[PDB]
């Protein structure tokens, strides 16, 4: 019992993205819908390999949203370039100052700007969209950020500025290489690696310092 051919706009046979156990997302076909216990499960046959039975927060539509349809806090899958499809949260919507991109805070802590054609809406997000973020530090951060929005204290940094930036519990000598909207590209001077970090993050010493006085 409990088999369904549709659940609103989720129709058996549609194209879909599904979350694999690797936490990367892959294209496939929605092959079944079933009510099991408190909710529905969605069976996905992936194009490349495999089948999965997934909750509604672990499938995404195979289309890009009209930008207008997404908000800060929206649950999305986005192209994670360091390319994979990975889940995250919309932290900022398109504006001229961000070159009309979405800022994504990914589930592992990564941040990037993506274009409108690089994200996919999760089909049935949780009402509090951060509640399915596995990493508790990430989960807590997103709840704080979304709840506080649009109050976003940020540090004004300039290319060439020297600051300490936190990473793995250590505060490292670092240099500001570039500013891009709400992100700064930080060069870690000891190891020579760059990281794009949110300008409101307390990993940046000036933000840490302010929050610690403040609280």
């Amino acid at each position: 019992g409990g088999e369904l051919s549709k659940d609103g706009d989720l129709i058996v046979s549609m194209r879909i993205l599904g979350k694999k156990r690797t936490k990367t997302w892959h294209k496939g076909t929605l092959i079944a819908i079933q009510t099991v216990g408190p909710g529905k499960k969605y069976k996905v046959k992936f194009d490349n390999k495999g089948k999965s039975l997934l909750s509604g927060n672990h499938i995404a539509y195979d289309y890009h949203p009209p930008a207008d349809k997404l908000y800060v806090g929206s649950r999305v899958v986005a192209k994670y370039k360091d390319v994979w499809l990975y889940a995250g949260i919309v932290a900022e919507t398109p504006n001229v100052k961000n070159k009309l991109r979405f800022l994504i805070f990914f589930d592992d802590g990564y941040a990037s700007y993506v274009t409108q054609s690089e994200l996919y809406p999760i089909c049935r997000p949780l009402k509090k969209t951060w509640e399915d973020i596995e990493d508790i530090s990430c989960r807590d951060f997103i709840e704080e950020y979304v709840t506080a929005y649009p109050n976003r204290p940020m540090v004004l940094l300039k290319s060439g500025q020297l600051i300490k930036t936190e990473w793995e519990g250590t505060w490292w000598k670092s240099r500001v290489e570039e500013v891009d909207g709400s992100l700064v590209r930080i060069l870690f001077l000891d190891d020579k690696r760059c990281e794009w970090i949110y300008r409101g993050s307390t990993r940046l010493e000036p933000m840490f310092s302010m929050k610690t006085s403040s609280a």
Partner: peptide, 9 residues
Amino acid sequence: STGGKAPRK
């Protein structure tokens, strides 16, 4: 690689 959004606890 990523250090996430807040310092390590």
